[PDB]
Amino acid sequence: VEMNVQYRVTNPEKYLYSVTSPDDSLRQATDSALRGVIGKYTMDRILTEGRT
Amino acid sequence: MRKSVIAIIIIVLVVLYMSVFVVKEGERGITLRFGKVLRDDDNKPLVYEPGLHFKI
């Protein structure tokens, strides 16, 4: 499975002084979500139905 | 009375720059003595908010 996440930023007071490497930290969260989500459904479902 | 007045004026400026220290928004600085930390309110170490503070 491959996914694309289009996002934006907000007021730099949060983005700059919330977490180190915000772009990288968000990527780790995305992997956990994708795997966790994928982990719930079966292969056949994920291939056709799970897409949405 | 020119060398005496000009000499004192110049030295105070460098002293003040070293003394002033501000704390960033996403950081917090705890002023420290030679080896210890500054305390207050029954030996509760004080952490500084994001504002200006003075250190000898």
PDB file of N, CA, C and O in Angstrom, chain A residues 13-14 16-20, chain B residues 23-29 49-50:
ATOM      1  N   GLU A  13       3.999  29.835  15.659  1.00  0.00           N
ATOM      2  CA  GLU A  13       4.295  29.668  17.077  1.00  0.00           C
ATOM      3  C   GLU A  13       4.101  28.216  17.491  1.00  0.00           C
ATOM      4  O   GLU A  13       4.844  27.700  18.335  1.00  0.00           O
ATOM      5  N   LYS A  14       3.111  27.541  16.906  1.00  0.00           N
ATOM      6  CA  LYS A  14       2.888  26.128  17.189  1.00  0.00           C
ATOM      7  C   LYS A  14       3.824  25.249  16.365  1.00  0.00           C
ATOM      8  O   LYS A  14       4.580  24.442  16.912  1.00  0.00           O
ATOM      9  N   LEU A  16       6.616  25.756  14.901  1.00  0.00           N
ATOM     10  CA  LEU A  16       8.037  25.872  15.208  1.00  0.00           C
ATOM     11  C   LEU A  16       8.393  25.461  16.627  1.00  0.00           C
ATOM     12  O   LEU A  16       9.511  24.980  16.849  1.00  0.00           O
ATOM     13  N   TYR A  17       7.485  25.631  17.590  1.00  0.00           N
ATOM     14  CA  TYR A  17       7.775  25.354  18.993  1.00  0.00           C
ATOM     15  C   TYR A  17       6.801  24.359  19.619  1.00  0.00           C
ATOM     16  O   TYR A  17       6.373  24.524  20.764  1.00  0.00           O
ATOM     17  N   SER A  18       6.434  23.315  18.872  1.00  0.00           N
ATOM     18  CA  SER A  18       5.599  22.229  19.379  1.00  0.00           C
ATOM     19  C   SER A  18       6.359  20.913  19.443  1.00  0.00           C
ATOM     20  O   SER A  18       6.389  20.260  20.491  1.00  0.00           O
ATOM     21  N   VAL A  19       6.964  20.506  18.326  1.00  0.00           N
ATOM     22  CA  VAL A  19       7.734  19.272  18.229  1.00  0.00           C
ATOM     23  C   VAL A  19       8.923  19.513  17.311  1.00  0.00           C
ATOM     24  O   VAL A  19       8.844  20.295  16.358  1.00  0.00           O
ATOM     25  N   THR A  20      10.032  18.838  17.599  1.00  0.00           N
ATOM     26  CA  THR A  20      11.184  18.934  16.718  1.00  0.00           C
ATOM     27  C   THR A  20      10.878  18.154  15.447  1.00  0.00           C
ATOM     28  O   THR A  20      10.231  17.103  15.491  1.00  0.00           O
TER      29      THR A  20
ATOM     30  N   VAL B  23      14.087  34.144  27.706  1.00  0.00           N
ATOM     31  CA  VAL B  23      13.681  32.752  27.542  1.00  0.00           C
ATOM     32  C   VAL B  23      12.777  32.657  26.321  1.00  0.00           C
ATOM     33  O   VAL B  23      11.788  33.392  26.210  1.00  0.00           O
ATOM     34  N   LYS B  24      13.122  31.753  25.405  1.00  0.00           N
ATOM     35  CA  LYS B  24      12.345  31.572  24.185  1.00  0.00           C
ATOM     36  C   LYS B  24      10.946  31.050  24.518  1.00  0.00           C
ATOM     37  O   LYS B  24      10.661  30.609  25.634  1.00  0.00           O
ATOM     38  N   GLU B  25      10.065  31.101  23.516  1.00  0.00           N
ATOM     39  CA  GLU B  25       8.691  30.650  23.712  1.00  0.00           C
ATOM     40  C   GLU B  25       8.625  29.144  23.947  1.00  0.00           C
ATOM     41  O   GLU B  25       7.986  28.686  24.901  1.00  0.00           O
ATOM     42  N   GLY B  26       9.283  28.356  23.095  1.00  0.00           N
ATOM     43  CA  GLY B  26       9.263  26.911  23.243  1.00  0.00           C
ATOM     44  C   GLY B  26      10.414  26.347  24.044  1.00  0.00           C
ATOM     45  O   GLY B  26      10.778  25.178  23.881  1.00  0.00           O
ATOM     46  N   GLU B  27      10.995  27.169  24.910  1.00  0.00           N
ATOM     47  CA  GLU B  27      12.091  26.753  25.767  1.00  0.00           C
ATOM     48  C   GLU B  27      11.894  27.404  27.124  1.00  0.00           C
ATOM     49  O   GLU B  27      11.160  28.386  27.264  1.00  0.00           O
ATOM     50  N   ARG B  28      12.556  26.840  28.129  1.00  0.00           N
ATOM     51  CA  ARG B  28      12.500  27.372  29.481  1.00  0.00           C
ATOM     52  C   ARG B  28      13.891  27.248  30.073  1.00  0.00           C
ATOM     53  O   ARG B  28      14.499  26.175  30.011  1.00  0.00           O
ATOM     54  N   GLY B  29      14.383  28.340  30.644  1.00  0.00           N
ATOM     55  CA  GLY B  29      15.709  28.386  31.239  1.00  0.00           C
ATOM     56  C   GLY B  29      15.621  28.514  32.748  1.00  0.00           C
ATOM     57  O   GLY B  29      14.817  29.290  33.269  1.00  0.00           O
ATOM     58  N   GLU B  49       9.525  31.743  32.751  1.00  0.00           N
ATOM     59  CA  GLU B  49       8.552  31.807  31.674  1.00  0.00           C
ATOM     60  C   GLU B  49       9.221  32.534  30.509  1.00  0.00           C
ATOM     61  O   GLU B  49      10.357  33.003  30.621  1.00  0.00           O
ATOM     62  N   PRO B  50       8.542  32.669  29.358  1.00  0.00           N
ATOM     63  CA  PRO B  50       9.220  33.374  28.240  1.00  0.00           C
ATOM     64  C   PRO B  50       9.217  34.898  28.368  1.00  0.00           C
ATOM     65  O   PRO B  50       8.462  35.628  27.725  1.00  0.00           O
TER      66      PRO B  50
END
